[PDB]
Structure formats: C-alpha cells, structure tokens
Symmetry: C3
Subunit: 171 residues, 3 copies
C-alpha cells in the first residue's frame, strides 16, 4: 500500500529557505518499479522569498544509509508516508526503495552529469522568465540525498511552478 | 484500475475547431499519490492544418465526484482502460480557479511538428475550473501553419 | 545480461554499473543507463549516457544515436549494449496503433527532452526519443545533439509512452 513519500498538500507555508515558514514547498515521491516519480514546486510567501537577494536558491533533503530522513527545509521535517495508505498504526516501509541508486548516482557525485536532472520552467509562470531547476541525486558524501537548485531573479518574488523528475532507486 | 485514457487510435478522435479535425492522445496512469500523464495532439483537417490563431487550448472538466463533464473528444471515449477522485488533481495544492497560480501550472518544452525551428511551450493547468476539477492544455501555435504537438508528459499530485 | 527484467515483470533495465557497458563508436566506450517501468498503460523511462573513451570523449559529429530494436513478440533483436542480451514483453513495447511502425516522421512518435551537455548550461542539447521507427516489430531510438571537439555526456532524463499491451 505504501507507494508514496511526501509532504502533505497544504495552503499554508511549510518550508524555511531563509526565515521560518517563508515558503510553501510541495515534494512528492511515488514508486513505480525501479523508478521514483517525483514532483516538486516551491512558492515564496514571506521575506526574502518575495524580494530575492540572490540569483539562485537551493534546498536539500538528506537521508542516512537506511533511508531515514536526517535534514530537510520543512518546518518540523514533515516528510513521510501518505496517511491512509496503510490501515496499520506506525506503518513500516523500505525507505531504500525510495532512495536514489548509489551505483548509478555515486555519493559525492554532484559533479557527474548522470547524477543531475535538468528541468526548464518559468519564474512565477512568466514566460519571459525562463529558469532552470537542477535536481541532483546523492550529492551528499554519505547516506542519500535529493538536492534542488532553481535559478531566480533578484529583486522579485520567487515561485517555481509544478515540475517533475524521475530517478532509479536503490532497492 | 490504474489507467484513464482515450484509447490509442490512428484516425481523428477530437474536435478543436470542426468535427474530428484532430487526433488527441491523453492517458493518465496512477502511481500512488501521482498521476503520470501523457498527451499529444495532431492536426488532421481544416484549420488545424492552417492555423488561424497563435495558441490552441483544450480542457477536460470534471464534477466534484470526478465524473467527466466536458472534453473536446468527438465521442465519449475518455474511459477506464479495458474511485475517480484518485485521478483528480489535488484541490488543496492546486486550488480551484487557480490558473493564475504558478503551482497550478506545469510547463513543457517541445517542437511544433517536431520542427527544430519551431520551439513551443505546452502549459498544463490543474484545476483552472472554479468548481469540480479540471485538466487544461494550451500550446503555442504558428498561424498559417499546421498544428501538431509531439509526445509529451506531465505529473501531478492527486486528490485521493 | 545487458537488459534484465525484474518483478510479474515491472522493470526492464540496464543493471546499475560503475563501468562502461555500451558501444556507440568503439567497444565499451560509454556508460548507458536505461530503465523502463510499467505503470498501467504507460512505460516510464529514464535514460542517461556518459562517454568514457574514444570518440565519445572528443566528438566528431553534432549528434549521436542509438536504438533498441525488438521483434513483433517484443523480443530484443539488437541494442548498443556490450552484453547484447536479455513476463509479457508486449506490455513494455510502444503502442503500434498510436506510434505507427516506420513513423519516425510523425510528430506524435517523437518525445523531445531539453538538457545540457555534461550538465553545462552553456551547452544546451536536445534528446529525441522516437517510438517504433522500425518498419517491423518495435523500437526505441535515442538521438542526442552534441558538440564537436568536446566530450559527450547526457545527464539524467526521462520520458513516457503508451504501451502495446
Ligand atoms: C554536473 C556538472 O557539474 N557538470 C560540469 C562538468 C562536469 O563536472 C565534468 O564534465 C565531469 O567530468 O564540468 C564542466 O566543466 C569542465 C571541467 O570542470 C570544463 O570547464 C572543462 O574543464 C577542463 O579542465 C577539462 O576538460 O577538465 C578543460 C575543458 O576544456 C573544459 N571544457 C569545456 C569545453 O569548457 C563541463 O563542461 O564539462 C562544467 C559542467 O557544469
Ligand atoms: C501562472 C501565471 O499566470 N503566472 C503569472 C504570474 C502569477 O499569476 C502571479 O505571480 C500569481 O501571484 O503573474 C505574473 O504577473 C508574474 O508574476 O510574473 C505573470 C505570470 O504570467
């Protein structure tokens, strides 16, 4: 039943890029065989996220060698199984079935082209503002990781539209 | 049930400007909280072969139970492949009436007719409709040229 | 083997490798990752290709193409894999009604991906994935643009097609 790891859809800020609860992140990973299908978007809500000082923005989810979450930008690290996918309390799952394959995407391999997945989108959906999202698999030297870097425009609000990506899993 | 689609076909099944003027492929497959969608649209007759406008938009609208209300298909062929809300775009993340919100939009780069001199954008929008659910597609087009949009795909989080 | 199927069968893939497994111009000159997973009527595909040796590290042409060709039962006939060897195979084949055989000239038989050579944004390239270019049986073709006198590597990408069964 457990095919999904996500942060729950919400209309309230749930993410901290520069200051607490300054943004609304969606991240969802669903398993289809040896693939994870991932979706992500990030909307600035407050502070610097509404008036950027830098030309790029990056966040990262890191996991240990068992697939257990170590760090994320989410307020209260609300990244877990989707509720209702198991009738049991405290549902167990194989977290490695959602981790990026460590043979194809070597740890510490952010400089390797095959560890990176590139997405073209538009800042705030404005078609005069093309930006790139770079998703990197296993940048971290130990454990597993998913890293997201978007290009951005200074002195404007940041928001990245709905996007998606796909990687091969460890198990 | 894992798949909602219009069945593969090689003859026109879709009405953009006039009856059966185009061939639409649309297929939605459920994987956990995601739908993986594929779409393409090939002009076959009439204005679809000699465009009058510089964009083309079609929409699938559903009621609040996930039942199809309208689409550009010639016949009622959008169907389960031989819980509707499990295929609908999430209405918390993609707010109804939210076509103007960036997170309700998914952008795809492709090429008109597969022509490298004709880069175009497909915008897929989730829940543009004020009520119920919707999937909307809008492609750039070139006037006085044929319209065809190659194979593309997209992904969204579901309601249930 | 070169392509292996995993559980009934939901995944066809090149097994993960640290070493070259593919022959574009010369034997074992590249590392290919190709993975096809069945999700209802879709295959979700991922692909990347890293040059390791020879012309792959110093390109002579502005594009590179490889193809996986299958017979009408879905059996693998040929691929660029070093280990050129390999369940309802038709469940993984591109749909021959929508993607007609010999139809590489039909826009709907082609899926375009924008990416960056060696992950360098000053080097935009396109991947064209084509379904059923073969006049008989089934096929998946991959063509990337490239830059002469530079090393070839195409980053992680993905694509999706409707299946025959
Ligand atoms: C994902 C990523 O970070 N990609 C970068 C790649 C990549 O790290 C390497 O290709 C992996 O081996 O490197 C890019 O820069 C390279 C080297 O880092 C170039 O600047 C080349 O540097 C040289 O020193 C080299 O060949 O090593 C000289 C060479 O002439 C340079 N290449 C050119 C043609 O600019 C890369 O483009 O490969 C940057 C990329 O973002
Ligand atoms: C999807 C969409 O329509 N995007 C539009 C956005 C958003 O509607 C607002 O940012 C919502 O707050 O508004 C713009 O003025 C912008 O910010 O550049 C133009 C852009 O085309």
């Amino acid at each position: 039943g457990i095919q999904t790891l996500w942060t729950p859809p919400t209309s309230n800020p749930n993410c901290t890029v520069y200051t607490e609860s300054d943004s609304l992140l969606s991240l969802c990973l669903t398993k289809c065989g040896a693939h994870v299908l991932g979706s992500v978007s990030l909307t600035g809500v407050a502070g610097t996220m509404t008036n950027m000082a830098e030309t790029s923005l990056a966040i990262e989810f890191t996991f240990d060698d068992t697939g257990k979450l170590l760090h994320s930008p989410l307020v209260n690290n609300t990244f877990s199984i989707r509720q209702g996918d198991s009738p049991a309390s405290n549902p167990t799952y194989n977290a490695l079935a959602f981790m990026p394959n460590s043979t194809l995407y070597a740890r510490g391999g952010s400089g390797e082209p095959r560890n990176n997945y590139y997405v073209q989108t538009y800042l705030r959906g404005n078609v005069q503002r093309p930006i790139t999202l770079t998703v990197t698999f296993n940048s971290a030297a130990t454990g597993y990781s998913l890293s997201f870097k978007w290009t951005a425009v200074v002195r404007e609000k940041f928001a990245a539209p709905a996007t998606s990506f796909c990687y091969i899993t460890e198990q």
